[PDB]
Paper text:
Using the optimized CCR5–chemokine proteins, the cryo-EM structures of MIP-1α–CCR5–Gi1 and RANTES–CCR5–Gi1 were determined with an overall resolution of 2.9 and 3.0 Å, respectively. The maps allowed unambiguous placement of most of residues in the receptor, chemokines, and G protein, except for the N- and C-termini of CCR5 (residues 1-15 and 314-319 in the MIP-1α-bound CCR5; residues 1-32 and 314-319 in the RANTES-bound CCR5) and the N-loop and 40s-loop of RANTES (residues 15–24 and 42–46). The extracellular ends of helices I and II move away from the central axis of the transmembrane helical bundle by about 5 Å in the RANTES–CCR5–Gi1 structure relative to those in the MIP-1α-bound structures. This alteration is most likely associated with the different binding modes of the chemokine N terminus, in which the residues Y3–D6 of RANTES are adjacent to the extracellular tip of helix II while the counterpart in MIP-1α shifts towards helix VII. The third residues in the two chemokines vary in their side chains with alanine in MIP-1α but a tyrosine in RANTES, resulting in different binding modes at this position. The bulky side chain of the RANTES residue Y3 wedges into a gap between helices I and II in CCR5 and makes contacts with Y371.39, V832.57, and W862.60, leading to the outward movements of these two helices relative to those in the MIP-1α-bound structures. Accompanying the outward shift of helix II in the RANTES-bound CCR5 structure, the chemokine residues S4–D6 occupy a binding site adjacent to helix II and ECL2 and form polar interactions with residues T177, S179, and S180 in ECL2. The residues S4-T7 of RANTES mainly form a polar interaction core with the receptor ECL2, while the counterpart in [5P7]RANTES packs against helices I and VII. In the structures of MIP-1α–CCR5–Gi1 and RANTES–CCR5–Gi1, the N termini of the chemokines adopt a ‘hook’-like conformation, which is stabilized by a salt bridge between the only negatively charged residue in this region (D5 in MIP-1α, D6 in RANTES) and the positively charged main-chain nitrogen of residue S1. Additionally, in both chemokine–CCR5–Gi1 complexes the side chain of the N-terminal residue S1 forms a hydrogen bond with the receptor residue Y2516.51 and the main chain of the third residue in the chemokines makes a hydrogen bond with E2837.39.
Numbering used by the authors:
A (entry chain B): 21 to 128, 133 to 340
B (entry chain A): 6 to 55, 182 to 233, 241 to 354
C (entry chain C): 27 to 61
D (entry chain R): 1 to 14, 25 to 41, 47 to 65, 128 to 187, 192 to 408
The structure:
Amino acid sequence: ARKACADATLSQITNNIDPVGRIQMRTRRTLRGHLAKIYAMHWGTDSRLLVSASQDGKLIIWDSYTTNKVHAIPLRSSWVMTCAYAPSGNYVACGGLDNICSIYNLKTVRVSRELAGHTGYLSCCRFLDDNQIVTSSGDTTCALWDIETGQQTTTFTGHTGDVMSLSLAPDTRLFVSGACDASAKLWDVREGMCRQTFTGHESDINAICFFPNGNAFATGSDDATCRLFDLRADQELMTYSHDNIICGITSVSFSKSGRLLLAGYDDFNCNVWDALKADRAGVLAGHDNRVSCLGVTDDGMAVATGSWDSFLKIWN
Amino acid sequence: SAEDKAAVERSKMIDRNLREDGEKAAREVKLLLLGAGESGKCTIVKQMKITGIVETHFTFKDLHFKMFDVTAQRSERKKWIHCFEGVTAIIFCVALSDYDLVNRMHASMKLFDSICNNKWFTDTSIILFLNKKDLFEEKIKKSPLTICYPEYAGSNTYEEAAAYIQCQFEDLNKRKDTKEIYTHFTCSTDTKNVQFVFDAVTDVIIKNNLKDCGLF
Amino acid sequence: RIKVSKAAADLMAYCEAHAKEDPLLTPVPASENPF
Amino acid sequence: SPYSSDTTPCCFAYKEYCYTSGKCSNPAVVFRQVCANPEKKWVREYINSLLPPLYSLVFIFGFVGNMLVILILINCKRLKSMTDIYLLNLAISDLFFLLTVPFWAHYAAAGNTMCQLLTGLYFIGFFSGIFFIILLTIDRYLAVVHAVFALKARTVTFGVVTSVITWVVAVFASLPNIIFTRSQKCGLHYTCSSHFPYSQYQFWKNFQTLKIVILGLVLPLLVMVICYSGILKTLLRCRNEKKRHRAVRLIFTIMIVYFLFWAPYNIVLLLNTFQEFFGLNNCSSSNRLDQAMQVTETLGMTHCCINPIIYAFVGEKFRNYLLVFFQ
C-alpha cells in the first residue's frame, strides 16, 4: 500500500533547511519577431539556440545570447502547439493539428520528413536522441518514432483522456506524461511497458517535467496546484497550492538544483515555488497575455518564458 | 565583429520576410467550421472555386477565404479550441433534418452553445448555416417537429419551422450586443452559398475596422 | 517501493549539494553572465 | 497669425526702420510714424539703405494627451495596423502645434532665423495635422466602404509613403511664409512679424489667404462629409441598435467640433485680409480683430489638444490598452 509507507512528509523534513526567500528576477531581454500566440518551446544543451512555434505558420530559431533569428521555417500548418529541439542541434520537431510531427534539419533550412500516423492532435514532442523521437498526440496514448525509418516503433497507451505533455529523464531512459484523467504514467523507452501511474490530481494536467536527478517529477494541473511525484515512493510527494491562485497551469519546469519550481499559470504571469518548503520565491511578470510555454537552460544560465503576446523574456 | 555583423544582417533579412508573410495573414480571412452530429463541414466544400484538419483555399471577389474542418479531431474541444481565436468568422453548419435521429439537434445546440458562450470566442462572429434544406421539406409532412422541441409554434409549416429553428439559436447566444451571429439557409446553387459568406465576412471586417478606427 | 522519508531525504540531499551550482538560486556575476 | 507677437501697428492712412505685419491691408513702411510710401519712394529707399493660466494648462493637457497616445502604440499596438502610424504622426504634428507657445513666451520679455524656423514649425505642424485628419478620414472611408480593398491595399509601407508625401507637401505649402518673413524687432522687446515683399502685396496676400482658408475648411470638410456619408450608408445596415447609434453620434460630434473649432479662424482671416467690410477704422477694427485672432488660435490649439481624445479614446479597444499599460 502507498499510504502504509507514508510515515512522514517532505515539508516536515525540509523545514529544517534554510528557506530561499525572495529572488531578484528581472527581464534582461525580450524576444520580438513573432506575430501570433506561442504555445511551446525547447532549450538546447548548449543554451545558445532557441526554438519557438507560433500560430502565424513560422517556426523560427532564436539566438538567446544576441536576440536574433538564425533560421526561418515556413510551417505548412499555422495551427501548431508543440515544438522540440534535438540535443544534437541538427533536427527540430514540430507538430500541430495535422496529427503530424514534421522534422526540419537545420544542418543543410530544409524539411527532412513529416511523420504521420496519429489520430488525435499532437501536443508534445521530445527528442530522445538524434535518431529516436517520442511524440504526444490526442489519442490518449503516446508513441515512439524514428527519423530514419519514419514509422511508429513503440506505442504507449493506458490513459483514458488525451495527453498534452511529456518530459524526458536526464538519461533518456524513462518518460512521464499527463492527461485529463489526472494520471501521470511512467513508461520505459526500451521495454515500452507502463511501470507505474501517478494519479491524485483533481483536474486536467497540462504541464509535466522531470527532476534533474530523475528520481522525482512534478506535474501541472488546471486546479491551481502542482503535485510532486517521486518514482521511489510511488505516490504524491508534496503539493504546491495557494488560495490566491485559482487559474490553471500550462508550463512547469525545474532548475539545475531543483530548489525552485517555475510554474506558468493562467494569470498572465509566472510564479516561482520552492520545491522543498512550498514557499513562493518570486513572481515572473511582464507578459500582457496568457503564458503557455516555459523552459530552463540545461546549464542553468537563464530561463525563457513565452506567452500568447508573441514575446519571450529571459530571466537570470 | 565580422561574425556578429553577419548574424544581425541575416536576421534583418528574416524579419523582412516575416513582415511580408505576416501581412498576407491580415488580408486573408480565417473561417472555422465545426459540427456536433457530423452535419458541419459539409456541402460547402463542393464549390466550383474550391491530414488532421481539411484546409481549403479560394478567392472570391478579390478576397481569399480559409476554412478549417475539425472532424478527425475526436479529443476534447477545450484543449485546442483556443487556437482558433481571433479569426474573422466561424461558419457553423447545422442540418435541419438532424432533429429526429439519435436527439441530434440537441447535441448540435449543446456544441453550438459551448463555442458561442466560450470565453475565447466572444470577439469573433459566428456564421450559422441550415443544411439539408431540400430534405427538410418532405420530412415535416411525415415527421412532426414536436419530437425535437416541445413547442413547435402550432403552425407545423416550413415558414414557421425554419423561423423557429433560426430564432431559437439566438437563445443559446448569451451575448447579443457583444457578439453578432449570422443565419442563412443554404441553397442548391454553389455560388449563392458563398455569396452570403462574402457578404457576412466583408461585414465583420467592417466591424473590426470601426473598432480599430475608434468608432466602436 | 521504499519509505517516503528515505526518498524525501535523498531529494533534498541532491539539491543541497547542487545548490552551489544553481545560477537561479545563487546569482551569477554580471560579467560571467552572458546576458 | 503665428502668435500674438505678429500684431504690429499698420499705416492705415497715408527715425527707425521697421516692417509691418501681413494682417493689414494697404501696407506702408513705418518711420512717430511718417508712412510716406511702401514703394516708389526715394526717401523710403534711402532709409532702408542703412487667460494666460488657462492657456498653459490646456497646453499641458494637450501635451500629456499627445505623448500618451504616442507611447501607447509602441507599448501595445507596436504600429502593426496601418492607421496607427497616421494617429502617431498626427500626435507628433499636434506636438509641433503646441510646443511653439512655450518658446513664444521665452522669445519675448528678454533671432531672425530662429523666428523663421519657429513659425515654420508652427505652420508645418498645423498643415500636417490638417492633412493627417484628412488622411484618417480617407482611411476610415476606405476601411468601411472598401473593406476588401482596404485589406488588399492598406500596407504599412504605403502609409509611410503617404505620411512622407504629406510632410513634404506641408513643408512646401509653408515655404512661402518661410521665404517671405523677417524678425523685424524694431523695439526693446522681441517681436516676430510676417512681411510680404510688397511687389504684389495685394495679390500675394490674397493668394496666401485663399490657400490657407481652402486647405483649412473646404478640403477637410468636403473629405469629411464624403467619407462620413459613405460610412453612414454602409453602417445603416449594421444590425446593431447601440453600436450604430453611437458611431453616427460620434461622427456628427467630430464634424461639428471641427467646424466650431476651425471655421471661426478662417472667417476672421477672410474678414481681416479682404478688408472690404471694415477697413476705414484704424484701431477700432484692429484691437477687436487681434483679440478675435487670439481667441480663434487658442480655440484651434484646444482642438489640436482634443484631437487625440476624439480619435483614440472614443474607441473601446483603445481604452483597454491604457488600463493594461497603467497596471
